[PDB]
Design a binder for this molecule. Structure first.
Ligand SMILES: CC(=O)OCC[N+](C)(C)C
Ligand SMILES: CC(=O)OCC[N+](C)(C)C
Ligand SMILES: CC(=O)OCC[N+](C)(C)C
Ligand SMILES: CC(=O)OCC[N+](C)(C)C
Ligand SMILES: CC(=O)OCC[N+](C)(C)C
Lengths: 307, 307, 307, 307, 307
């Protein structure tokens, strides 16, 4: 089995797509292995760029195809080069930009943590092995972060392993395992923007909704309720059109639903107070003054959104 | 006729497009057939990757083109390889990502079920036949699902058949049938998000609209109606800009229309009560108090949205 | 002049773009012509796929380039094949997906009818002629239609003709005409969704706007007017963001404008009634009760939106 | 210097992008020049299509590369052909679709006029010259225009000239000028849609805002103002989300700002009237009745939006 | 080491993407170096365009690959040419359009300044060196700017340097440095549109919100507050849907939040005044008349948004 060592340089992780559970990675891949020594002009190692590589392959040079297992679509590869040493070293180097897939749980939004992973297997050869993996994510830890969407826990962790393909015929009858490199990079979301521009105002609006009980008239209370209703709707719209699309509810989504519920409960009480009596317009004294029952009865059912 | 057996590995089904009735599929395809025995270096089977395959084809190697019948646009193929055994086996393997078409009925939205299908025929050869089909959809059944938009029934069903092309001249005068593989994967939509973030609040807002009848003044009742009207409009906007585009109405779309209707009927009654009398401001006693006629007269016409 | 007969199979028409006046078509093209008889392995006709075709062309095979006149950008062609008969028949077959252009009048929206056309000319040869055209639009007529956005009149009509290029130098000094095939498919839009989800509610909202005249106070009437105003704006927004972009007004656009007009006229009257008198608050009796003048004076100016 | 004459056929101008100041053009380019006479099969001129052209170039055929100076990105070229006459004429013909750039001033929106230009220079040869330019924009003038977004002044103007590249080393030490063709097509925007669907209603809404002064109470006047405020905001949103993005204000943008200003001035007056007196609720008689001061004081400051 | 001098002509900088921190650049690159003298037809330098270049490379011509370090994805290259002088000069020239990345701080929005940078390194050769850099950004300084989104300081600055790659094996054991050209162009954003169309109206709206304190009734003051609330929400939506997406708050974003806060504080006061007394409806005289406390207490906390 040929020993292949790869180093992966990661230049940029960007463009997360919540719906597709993908993210873009720009970087270089280097792969090295040793073969039969070779005669090279002078006795300096030889450099072969781009279109020239295929020529060498036609005349017999072995350059194994390494696949990104979890890439979605053919990656965009830029320049590639072979460095051919006379003593038989062969070093493959290429620039790449790809869309990579992973399981991504966005349920604890603004405060979610994800891992960006790369998975590398040789495409055709079970009979050749990854000797070691080195990722150089030489961005940086504590620096520009409040300029960036994602904060890296860093540096990346690696794992060479063996994957069994049971339904894939192979060269020999016994050997059906592939060598796989797996790189993982952990990251937390920069929750600032969403706290200050979404969660805060949502709170303010929800709170202010409670000030309905400090209105004197029943007519005033009920009528104003419908305007608070409209406000939550506008806010849900705003919230939904600007936040990332998902197939499930986030914490912000729940707050919105709570807002709706509070305002509906209010409309129930407000109407109840006015007709739970013994005359016509005897608003239930104590009740119409649950100007403290709601706010904290909601901060109770609001501390069970975190259980 | 040459016997070709194919296995399809499905990695990912994503990116449904409701308007185009398409969906994206990432996977591998493997196709095997036996030909004339061959001399191979050593006597180990031979591996041929990517650009090298065309070379073998020019020197006479037969590699039939298999077409995805229901793909929309040329699929993006990654690496491909031929594995050439000395005893004449030939195995073709390629990575692919394509947009596939199928008839898709989204009428019973949030609760719709679809089938993602693949259809494979040889492009030029009627005179070669699919021996068997195996799909390995080794994602998984009951696991991550609430993380995913679609839930798979699984595993996929297969079916080799013969398709007659009556208006397509062929090699011989009699033979105009093509061998076709058809893969089907069933799936139900994860209805959670839409229940809690759309259907529920729509309900609340529709209900609350009913509380118009508990207002004392006619002036209060009619004027408030126009605000409920605006609310349903905002809600329709929100609902439309965020839900999948379709050429027909979904259940949610109907709820919205009901909301509009209820609010219009109300404005009719409210105005009727005020002028069906014998004076000037004698609001029809019994009627203005259909605070229960509407809510259940609507839950009646609301159980005929399901007949 | 060489006789070429072409058949066009149409798999899918989709993705209309109103602004660009384009639409996408997926299908196969087949083109047949006879040349000098040929020696073929065995004496069976010979099949040549994809990359192999250019090889045959380099060695002298004539394969005329047929251009889609009204395609916008290079079409995406999938597999292509030549079938070479020993008696000299040559059949070219290719899968294609392309964006096609045509004049498209969307003025009578939801109820518009369009024709999807293809136009085929040889690219370089005036000196070769289309013998006949067959389109197999074997979708189907009355079937799935309420699942589809467009309903086909069907089947397609065809048209071979000759086009004169006066400013294009040609092989000989006299001959400057090209053989053109033109396929036409008629289609009507599925107007359901827009009737029930846009036109209907617009109507309700417009009607409800009229109920402003059944308000007792002048203050009540004028103030409520501004809310109806806001409602039409919200509705216009909703309508515009969701309906297809056009450089002109559709029927729905006009309804919206009417809505605006009605509500402005009402604000004029409402203010007039209050100051066309002889005191201070003597609302012109008869006028403030044009609760029937408007509704039908609008259904009059609403039956001149169709003259 | 070789004399090259080019004709450009323009099929379609579409897809203007206001932000990028680009537009799409689909057409054919033809370029003709004479070289050394040649032996051709028969003695008929010879036709060479697509992949075959490169072959001729390898064997020595000269085909100069003509660059679209103001294209943004590599244009999409369809079929291309060489027509080789035995007397040495050589005619190059290719289909093209490209994104072209020009300075574009959208300041006088709905009523802006633009020019769509093409600029052609040889890529490498200063030492070869454009003899003449003919554009065949055989669309048409007064015909379908209300179906189209842009109206062409027509026909296009042309202008061969010489461009000096001072910082570009050339074949000889003296010669650093390139032959450039420049095509210009003038066009005016079809202002209908924007007049009837944006400018008109904006007017109505602005006018109606003035009817605030015909309200009896101060409370009524101030409170209603805030609703007019909200309306202008909704309208700005609607206007912005639907109109073309620009880095500057259009006339419509200014109207919107005026609307905002009028409504703010009103709020100032309304509050002033109520407290510029000598008691408590003595609304300044004359002032509260500037129901004509505003409307025309605005049509004054509204005729200085056009100075 | 081979001396390579490059000139970069910049035609267009456009398409900034705030989320990705990228921008598009269209231009030409020219690279020159001297090699072994050569026999050329006549003794005029020789021009080699496009596909022909690879041919010369197969026959031994050395054309080093220059990589844009900070491009994102393979740039779109148009025409390329080699100019081969007989005395051994070699000049490579290519048109390019690429998406480039840089650190981009948009925190001080409408008034941010950015630098558009290019970074060039040889892809494989450490053993070859950039002798000098010239950028010809011959757009222009003070001219069309109010037509353009970005205003260039100009002209660009350059800087050849040496970059150490510690984890990249090289030709010789010692030499692991690459020659890198860095071009920088400074630019300020055209803040007009955002001042007049966003910041201004936001101000007006915020100010008008203060006029709530000039309402007579408590009921009037509280109820009107909820409409001002809704207005800020609509405005936030409008602002968010139209302004560039970012992972952090801009100045505009902060104004919005202030608006929310002012309105909430008002609701607190308004309710406080009404219940900080000694009866039932004794609105705290002095307080309810903080019609000047707020406006300047906000212009105070509004001059600490700039500390
Ligand atoms: C299932 C299958 O086709 O795998 C091929 C690619 N490989 C071995 C790298 C995963
Ligand atoms: C209609 C037509 O061209 O079919 C050719 C390809 N085939 C037989 C695989 C569908
Ligand atoms: C105008 C022009 O160049 O037309 C050539 C292609 N043709 C004849 C198929 C339309
Ligand atoms: C600056 C530069 O590279 O120009 C080359 C192309 N030309 C001469 C057609 C503009
Ligand atoms: C890290 C790496 O792969 O660099 C290769 C390209 N280079 C040397 C020009 C930066």
């Amino acid at each position: 089995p040929v020993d292949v060592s790869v180093s992966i340089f990661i230049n940029k992780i960007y463009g997360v797509n919540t719906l597709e559970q993908t993210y873009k990675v720009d970087g270089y891949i280097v792969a090295q292995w040793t073969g039969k020594p070779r005669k090279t002009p002078g006795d300096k190692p030889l450099i072969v760029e781009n279109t020239q590589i295929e020529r060498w392959i036609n005349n017999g040079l072995w350059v194994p195809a390494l696949e990104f297992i979890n890439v979605v679509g053919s990656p965009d590869t830029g320049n590639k080069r072979l460095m051919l040493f006379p003593d038989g070293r062969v070093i493959y180097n290429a620039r790449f930009l790809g869309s990579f897939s992973n399981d991504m749980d966005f349920r604890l939004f603004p405060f979610d943590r994800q891992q960006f992973v790369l998975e590398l297997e040789p495409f055709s050869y079970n009979n050749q092995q990854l000797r070691f993996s080195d990722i150089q994510v030489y961005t940086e830890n504590i620096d520009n972060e409040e300029i960036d969407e994602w904060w890296i826990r860093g540096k990346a962790s690696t794992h060479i392993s063996d994957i069994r393909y049971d339904h894939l015929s192979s060269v020999q009858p016994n050997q059906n395992e592939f060598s796989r490199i797996t790189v993982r990079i952990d990251a937390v979301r920069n929750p600032s923007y969403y706290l200050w521009s979404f969660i805060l105002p949502l709170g303010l609006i929800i709170a202010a909704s409670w000030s309905v009980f400090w209105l004197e008239s029943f007519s005033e209370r009920l009528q104003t309720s419908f305007t608070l209703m409209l406000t939550v709707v506008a806010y849900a719209f705003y919230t939904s059109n600007i936040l990332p699309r998902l197939p499930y509810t986030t914490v912000i989504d729940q707050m919105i639903i709570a807002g709706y519920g509070s305002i509906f409960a209010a409309i129930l009480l407000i109407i109840f107070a006015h007709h739970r009596q013994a005359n016509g317009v005897e608003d239930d004294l104590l009740i119409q003054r649950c100007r403290l029952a709601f706010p904290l009865g909601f901060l109770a059912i609001g501390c069970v959104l975190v259980i």
